[PDB]
Symmetry: C3
């Protein structure tokens, strides 16, 4: 199979600057060279160049709506494209709002995809529930059908089409859910596993369940939107919104490992790595490396080891 | 329901000074303001002013027996009082010897209460088994019926009445048990879950069992005596007796979360936070915050999120 | 039963210097005094003095083959000796190549011993698969029968006799396995538990299985070759090859605790503690202490507590 890396240097999803430098760091850490060393064909599509919407006024609270809608519009296009040619797409973050784009384009080509969202937050606030207008905290609201018409059309997102229903998404690692957001996920009966659940069930049973819950009936394509903040800050320090008491490096890799084992990985998102927010070089290198690590996991790299087939090492 | 906070500025339970500054820090961290934000009525009763027994000579090894017996006698009184008015009491530590008082007063009003003791130590040494005379390491021995008459009447505790039996208490997080103490908990067949058990069973099954074990027959009031030392030192550094390889921040919150879910929380103890023992501001703030956090957990605050009923966030 | 401590100050197993200072640190931390405090007879055999083979030229890639073969030859001798007198041997590392010696001597006296290898690495590279000639990464290859003749005789190991088969060893905590090494452990069908397994099954079930797998039929002597690198670097920092996402202090102690509980402990290896590789005093003391701790665990020390029999602490 083919693997296509698409850098999305974007950050207007939220106020903190730096995230755009994200895909650069990941590459510098050698994500591509390493990926090539797996059983997959690696094609680096490069870094999208986003056009900045001049005079992008705040639609109510929502900030930079037009810039974020144009950034995402453009991505969904590139993603739909490579997805069409049969290659798995791997979007490197800036912030998480690029998920609207990533998930959209992919949805075009595979409308029956299910989404596994590993993150500390739900990011399901609507333009009417956010406290800040940071669109990085509203991604899943633009993609959800059940939430269509539940909020006023946003300047620039007119191209968006609610592609999945609350019965196709599964959250893992939740621990900082705004009140509104909690209502939304309870009302729509969305399947999640808050940290408390991971604690109660153990990362193992968690996957076991998320799978039989998303692939019990039909075996469909899987979209992994992994928000590097879903791991405890100790592991991924250089982030915009760290929240303590989260997934461990081990648990993180177990998810990507089980996901690889299903062979249904269709699209990936390695978002929120902010090279500038490291309190020391270590913290950033630390973050950038577990990010690069989680990815390689989705594509083979097993912790027990890997040997090349048809070769007798004896 | 009503919630009443009672600060117990005491520290003669053990040699290290500072713990009395405990309830102050917790408040400074805003325990009250936050508590108010939950579905409970918060009443701050203030900080008990303890009278210091002049010329309190060591009854054998037991140190400051009269001061500690007067401190606890006074608390049990305030606790019995508010417990009577139907409010849940939440005692902020100084040291853990204040538990004799806390558990006693509460027992008066609800003699059928069971006690869940989350701690690094058993604290079940009798005046005849301690190595030091620190009464903070003997609390459960004054409350236990099975241990009545097993030791010399202590100067000042004459008011105490063994209110519970070894069949009403459950330990969670044990890892530093003196030889004598181990004998005592084995002989009396007390139900506990040493770290090794948490490890073998997982915090999940642990609660599942401690509940069917304490609430299988009758559903009675629960007394949670939480010793901040029960978490690994990494999480609650500013303590008098850190012991490595203990509960994680996650596990800690899981217990308080499952306890809230039973709706039987009758009384709480947030003990051993010692603002002065922090090797850096961080460590204390770190400690003080996970303490404040565990509390809010017992009273609603779920990690998956919380939304106010009857309100349509859409 | 008797306990015999044998210090092996060796380090030519790998390029990084310092590991020889290993057994010294452990002793300084008071391993012996503490061990004495358990229900075992402690005899300190001292520190072997290794003769340095002059002009030890590299056999192909394998470095210091003669020095390492003489170091191990000598150890196997001392170990076979004390093992003969019926005492349990406890070898303190330098590097892990001393395992050839340790396991060999022991095998002489108890040819039916099974080996539990707690380590981050497999250390099963043969002189023909290593990238470096560091023999510390080849120990299990010299001891395995199935790998006999699979590589050219090495200068100094002529005395070695493949004592165990791939059906007697069990790995726990694997996470950094070279490609060759992975082939070897897959081809020979060796039973292991890579971190992913620990994650999936939980340290509890892991032991439960490793036991019924090694002691289901016959109850034989157990050799515990514990490589301090098997725990996450956070816990045992001062090592030559740290690899993140490994066993936790808790899990580590759980293994040594379950192993003690089988009563079949015949020989031990506390290897890779490198006092000089600590980035600060703390890190080394931290490392040296969890090492000393794991040992005491294998010999009684329970986390729930220990009391001396026939003594009424009341
Ligand atoms: Mn997110
Ligand atoms: Mn997030
Ligand atoms: Mn205590
Ligand atoms: Mn304690
Ligand atoms: Mn090793
Ligand atoms: Mn190793």
């Amino acid at each position: 199979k083919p693997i296509e890396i698409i850098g999305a240097p974007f950050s207007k999803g939220q106020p903190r600057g730096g995230v755009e430098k994200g895909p650069a760091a990941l590459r510098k850490a050698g994500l591509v060279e390493k990926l090539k060393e797996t059983e997959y064909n690696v094609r680096d599509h490069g870094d999208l160049a986003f056009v900045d919407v001049p005079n992008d006024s705040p639609f109510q609270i929502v900030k930079n709506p037009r810039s974020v809608g144009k950034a995402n519009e453009q991505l969904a296009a590139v993603v739909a494209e490579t997805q069409k040619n049969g290659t798995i797409s791997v979007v490197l973050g800036g912030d998480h709002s690029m998920a609207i784009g990533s998930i959209s384009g992919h949805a075009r080509v595979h409308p029956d995809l299910c989404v596994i969202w590993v993150d500390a937050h739900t990011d399901i606030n609507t333009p009417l529930t956010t406290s800040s207008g940071n669109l990085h905290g509203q991604p899943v609201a633009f993609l959800l059908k059940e939430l269509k018409g539940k909020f006023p059309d946003v300047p620039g997102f007119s191209w968006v089409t609610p592609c999945i229903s609350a019965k196709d998404i599964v959250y893992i690692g939740l621990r900082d859910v705004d009140p509104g957001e909690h209502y939304i996920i309870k009302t729509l009966g969305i399947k999640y596993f808050s940290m408390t659940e991971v604690d109660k069930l153990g990362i193992g049973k968690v996957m076991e369940e998320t799978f039989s819950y998303l692939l019990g009936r039909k075996k469909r394509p899987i979209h992994l939107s992994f928000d590097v903040e879903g791991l405890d800050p100790v592991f991924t320090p250089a982030t915009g919104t760290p929240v303590v008491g989260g997934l461990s490096y081990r648990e993180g890799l177990y998810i990507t490992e089980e996901i690889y084992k299903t062979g249904l990985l269709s699209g990936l998102d390695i978002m929120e790595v902010n090279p500038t927010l490291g309190k020391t070089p270590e913290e950033v290198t630390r973050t950038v490396n577990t990010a690069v690590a989680l990815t390689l996991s989705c594509f083979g790299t097993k912790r027990e080891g890997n040997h090349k087939p048809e070769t007798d090492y004896l």
